[PDB]
Amino acid sequence: VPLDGGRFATSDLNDLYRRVINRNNRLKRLLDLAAPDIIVRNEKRMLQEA
């Protein structure tokens, strides 16, 4: 909903989806550069938590 002013009343669903898609995109980008195993394990854990 575009309320008064140059601000947006973002629903929590939008924030959750943005976080999840950002984590997924970061993991997908990181998986094509042969990152260290610990790094991808931690990032996968973060994605699973999200």
Partner: protein, 50 residues
């Protein structure tokens, strides 16, 4: 409706950490060990063999 191509598989909470753990008692496991396995703290064996 759209879909997000998850790079790595993830586990459903509703089928994991309810009062009866569906995956836990389907595989004849407690909840603590499956939780530890899913959150990247310990390894599990597949097809031990000889």
């Amino acid at each position: 409706m759209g879909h997000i191509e998850l790079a790595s598989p993830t586990a459903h909470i509703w089928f994991l950490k309810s009062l009866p753990s569906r995956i836990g008692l389907l595989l004849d496991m407690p909840l603590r060990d499956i939780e530890r396995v899913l959150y990247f703290e310990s390894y599990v064996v597949i097809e031990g063999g000889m």
